[PDB]
Design a protein around this ligand. Structure first.
Ligand SMILES: CCCCCCCCCCC(CCCCCCCCCC)(CO[C@H]1O[C@@H](CO)[C@H](O[C@@H]2O[C@@H](CO)[C@H](O)[C@@H](O)[C@@H]2O)[C@@H](O)[C@@H]1O)CO[C@H]1O[C@@H](CO)[C@H](O[C@@H]2O[C@@H](CO)[C@H](O)[C@@H](O)[C@@H]2O)[C@@H](O)[C@H]1O
Length: 225
């Protein structure tokens, strides 16, 4: 049953993600505008050329897949939450509703944080560091810039879900707040690994690790037992 439940809830979540991805595909040219907007306004001297051969569809498929996941985030959050509580951990179903709503708005606040705080900051640390206008002119590849935005935006959505899945595991006594306090020296490496994968330089790898450790230290404080 628990074996089969996942092998059906997965297919429902995967079915939702593709419906969401297809929607994202249709209005992708407009989503490409929202993404281009942060650079276009801050450093207009920086040209977004397509250094790539004939790959504006790869940029499309990346856009249709990442944005298709932010559309499906409410369905995916539900399939997680229903497979765990009241299913295994909690007991009340009107503790589940404020949990789903709370976790739906934590993925949205995560994406807004990346797009409106991490990213503009990540651009000043990259090309806004004084007179670096010479090494940044038709030097920007759109496939580079778009991807970094999509990585940063999706990672922060997910990174924000940590203090709820954690508070709920700590409450269900699956983990203790001291067990997170012991994993600190490993999450510092986790955060810098994630920061190495998604960020282009050290300045941005660090810029990313900071809110991640901060989200980890929010989970320990939600060690109210
Ligand atoms: C969960 C479902 C998914 C929801 C999110 C998906 C993405 C939604 C963004 C898409 C969308 C609304 C779509 C709504 C329908 C959703 C239905 C969902 C599926 C249901 C099953 C944004 O909608 C608006 O959003 C705001 C921008 O953020 C703005 O609104 C207000 O505006 C101010 C006005 O005065 C207000 O004063 C201000 O207050 C707000 O700024 C508008 O600028 C914008 O149109 C449409 O935008 C774009 O669509 C594309 C066609 O692909 C259009 O194609 C191009 O346009 C031609 C023009 O000639 C070009 O010639 C041609 O190149 C091409 O043809 C674009 O033109 C474009 O307009």
């Amino acid at each position: 049953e628990h074996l089969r439940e996942l092998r059906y809830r997965l297919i429902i979540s995967i079915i939702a993600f593709l419906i969401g991805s297809g929607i994202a595909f249709y209005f992708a040219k407009y989503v490409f505008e929202i993404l281009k907007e942060p650079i276009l306004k801050s450093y207009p001297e920086v040209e977004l050329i397509t250094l790539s051969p004939t790959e504006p569809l790869f940029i499309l498929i990346k856009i249709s897949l990442a944005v298709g996941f932010i559309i499906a985030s409410p369905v995916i959050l539900y399939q997680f939450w229903r497979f765990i509580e009241p299913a295994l951990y909690s007991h009340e179903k009107r503790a589940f509703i404020p949990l789903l709503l709370g976790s739906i708005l934590l993925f949205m606040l995560g994406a807004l944080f990346a797009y409106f705080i991490v990213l503009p900051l990540a651009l000043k640390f990259l090309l806004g560091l004084g007179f670096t206008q010479l090494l940044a002119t038709p030097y920007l590849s759109v496939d580079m810039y778009i991807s970094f935005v999509l990585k940063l935006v999706v990672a922060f959505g997910i990174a924000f879900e940590m203090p709820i899945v954690l508070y709920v595991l700590q409450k269900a006594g699956v983990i203790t707040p001291e067990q997170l306090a012991s994993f600190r020296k490993y999450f510092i490496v986790i955060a810098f690994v994630i920061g190495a994968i998604i960020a282009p330089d050290v300045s941005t790898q660090v810029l990313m690790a900071i809110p991640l450790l901060l989200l980890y230290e929010i989970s320990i404080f939600l060690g109210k037992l």
